[PDB]
């Protein structure tokens, strides 16, 4: 009978004051939280942030909403959330978040006979994640979502992960183009500001980069360009136009690779290991072109020595480049 | 007791005229400001602005909200902020700002028995910072945030920094990849417009650009090509093929470098320091080629004077280039 339910609901909201928290002036109200991750869209090094879509559920108790005579959970229209008290929960490290609103505002209010309120939202949030790129491409990142009460201190509100470590679900079926989620972690603490101590929850992920993306995008092209640069040592030094064109083309294409990689990462003043590797590849192609110039200069005097320089280079360049790659890859160990 | 507190708050808001400021028609009301900086997300030279996230707290006294008998500071739900008078504070140089609204509008209202109101907001603002890049990439910037009353003159409202120099915190949290905060400064003043005099607070930051090998690698190609152009002076006139090859190589490489740097440097359509440096290098290689042409012209008439001209150029060109570099690095540093 909907008439009885309407009478009950109208009675509950009769004289209800939304400006006062449950048990105002007494012990803190305890809010339990669940998160169901639906996706982690775009981890960005350039912007130092990531996007996250989730179902965010909050659980508290308000004795002003206890009802009797109806043995049911009352799922109410979500606009009822505007007539009740809700926690002022927010994400400290976010930059732009919204609550989905098609076809209606993605919100859920469910009441239970003992006064317990379940309040659910569907949120897409972009959250900051500062990254350490000194070990690119073998770097490992740690990205967090920080959850805090904006206005109420620990004397008025309390947070806990509802369900222990089983509070956050859906993490194990997240696929990223470049990373893999090695681990996630749940933490609870108190954080002190000039206005007092506030409860805090933290959900952290550890991301590990897949080297298959750095390869096939930056490494394989560099190796191919260096091989093409070496090719010129097998042509007679009479063919000046061919060798000059080959050297210039290799230099310009290696410069393109360097600039492209530098643009895919944020601009920082210092020099990383990967920058050293790309500079080494550039040095190798430029040294091949310069060796041709040196052979051409010395050809007028001792053509036999001019040919011997090419013969020696045919062996020296591949060997030294292989040793350089080995040294670079053993730097990371 | 929640009912007693509800009736007290109802009495507070009973007959409360929100349209009138505190002490309307009398002395001005003093509002103290606090800012806690979360981050400075980005600093754009092309758009000439920077993005700032902050907790902005305002402190004032309203005698209409004084209450007695409750020895507590009442933290009210942020929706109550719509039933209270708040200052019409605005930022003069902001271009696009918003208050974060997940999961609720990040707003805080705290009352004290004396009638004192604390009002806190979490705000992201894209503030305009007109930059002088005539010394790029070794420029120093000064980016400000201006805080002002819009509708109330100094006969109605007063502004001050609460705590003095300790009114702004979190400058250590600012982590710009490309800049480094040198200093921050707090200013209080009055600004006169055609409608009267208004209070003004001003928070300014001094920024220094970080210099690295990547800043260094913009001058090195030009310097190397200039030295290559010098090299031609040591070649005998009989081997003019080498001299002309050096001339054409240097001129083409220099022009290509200049056009590429125009393409890659940030699109700022006025003269900077590096533009003049590149122009000077181009002038030097052009002068070297012109000197070769003059020597080739006078060769058949004054071979001894031609050799003397080459020998004197061998010293003059590096000397004048060192002089040009010295003048440049003393004027722009």
């Amino acid at each position: 009978n909907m008439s009885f339910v309407k009478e009950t609901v109208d009675k509950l909201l009769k004289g209800y004051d939304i400006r006062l928290r449950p048990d105002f002036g007494g012990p803190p109200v305890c809010v339990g939280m669940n998160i169901d991750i639906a996706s982690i869209d775009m981890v960005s090094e350039v912007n130092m942030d990531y996007t996250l879509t989730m179902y965010f559920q909050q659980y508290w108790r308000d004795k002003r909403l206890a009802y009797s005579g109806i043995p049911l959970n009352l799922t109410l229209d979500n606009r009822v959330a505007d007539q009740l008290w809700v926690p002022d929960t927010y994400f400290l490290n976010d930059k732009k978040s919204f609550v989905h609103g098609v076809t209606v505002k993605n919100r859920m209010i469910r009441l239970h006979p003992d006064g317990t309120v379940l309040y659910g939202l569907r949120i897409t949030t972009t959250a900051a994640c500062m990254m350490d790129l000194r070990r690119y491409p073998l770097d490992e990142q740690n990205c967090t979502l920080e959850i805090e009460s904006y206005g109420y201190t620990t004397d008025d509100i309390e947070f806990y992960w509802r369900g222990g470590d089983k509070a956050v679900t859906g993490v194990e079926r997240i696929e990223l183009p470049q990373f893999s989620i090695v681990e996630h972690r749940l933490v609870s603490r108190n954080v002190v500001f000039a206005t007092g101590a506030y409860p805090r929850l933290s959900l952290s992920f550890r991301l590990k980069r897949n080297i298959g993306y750095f390869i096939l995008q930056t490494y394989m092209p560099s190796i191919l360009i260096t091989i093409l640069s070496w090719v010129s040592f097998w042509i007679n030094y009479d063919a000046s136009a061919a060798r000059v064109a080959l050297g210039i083309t290799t230099v310009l294409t290696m410069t393109t690779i360097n600039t492209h990689l530098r643009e895919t990462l944020p601009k920082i003043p210092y020099v990383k290991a990967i920058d050293m590797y790309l500079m080494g590849c550039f040095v190798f192609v430029f040294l091949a072109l310069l060796e041709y110039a040196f052979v051409n200069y010395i050809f007028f005097s001792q053509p036999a020595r001019a040919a011997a320089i090419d013969r020696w280079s045919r062996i020296v360049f591949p060997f030294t480049f292989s040793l350089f790659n080995l040294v670079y890859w053993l730097y990371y160990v | 007791n929640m009912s007693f507190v509800k009736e007290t708050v109802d009495k507070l808001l009973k007959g409360y005229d929100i349209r009138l400021r505190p002490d309307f028609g009398g002395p001005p009301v003093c509002v103290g400001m606090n800012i806690d900086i979360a981050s400075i997300d980005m600093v754009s030279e092309v758009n000439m602005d920077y993005t700032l996230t902050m907790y902005f707290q305002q402190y004032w006294r309203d005698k209409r909200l004084a209450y007695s008998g409750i020895p507590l500071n009442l933290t009210l739900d942020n929706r109550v902020a719509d039933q209270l008078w708040v200052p019409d504070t605005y930022f003069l140089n902001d271009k696009k700002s918003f208050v974060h609204g997940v999961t609720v509008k990040n707003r805080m209202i705290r009352l004290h028995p004396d009638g004192t109101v604390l009002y806190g907001l979490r705000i992201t603002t894209t503030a305009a910072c007109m930059m002088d890049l005539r010394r790029y990439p070794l420029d120093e910037q000064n980016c400000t945030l201006e805080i002002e009353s819009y509708g109330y003159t100094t006969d109605d409202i007063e502004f001050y920094w609460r705590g003095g120099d300790k009114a702004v915190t979190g400058v250590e949290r600012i982590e710009l990849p490309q800049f480094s905060i040198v200093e921050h400064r707090l200013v209080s003043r009055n600004v006169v417009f055609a409608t009267g005099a208004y209070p003004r607070l001003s928070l300014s930051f001094r920024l220094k650009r970080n210099i690295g090998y990547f800043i260094l690698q913009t001058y090195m190609p030009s310097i190397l090509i200039t030295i290559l152009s010098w090299v031609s002076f040591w070649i005998n006139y009989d081997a003019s093929a080498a001299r002309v090859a050096l001339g054409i190589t240097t001129v083409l490489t220099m022009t290509t470098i200049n056009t590429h740097l125009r393409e890659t440097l940030p699109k700022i359509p006025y003269v900077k320091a590096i533009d003049m440096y590149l122009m000077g290098c181009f002038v030097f290689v052009f002068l070297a080629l012109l000197e070769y042409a003059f020597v080739n012209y006078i060769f058949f008439s004054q071979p001894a004077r031609a050799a003397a001209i080459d020998r004197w150029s061998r010293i003059v060109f590096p000397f004048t280039f060192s002089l040009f570099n010295l003048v440049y690095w003393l004027y722009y540093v």
Partner: nanobody
Amino acid sequence: LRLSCAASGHTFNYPIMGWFRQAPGKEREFVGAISWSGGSTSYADSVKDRFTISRDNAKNTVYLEMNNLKPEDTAVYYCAAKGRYSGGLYYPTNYDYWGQGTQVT
């Protein structure tokens, strides 16, 4: 008198090192704090313009240089690390990893 605090490990997650001193009959008191990267510094009023804080990443170490010592400085000194989103800078509770008590007279 110069104090050294050498921090090793995941120092990127904890970008701020702070210094505290505890009196024999009082609680821990903030002295100063330095950012790992920018070197930005903050000091207490009682120690401002007397103490200085510096750091170097060559061995991941921070330094507190004490000048114009007073009998009021007799306290056991600690060095602590603070996370990126841990709130206020002047509160010992926000600091996760703590050093070893050093006696200064």
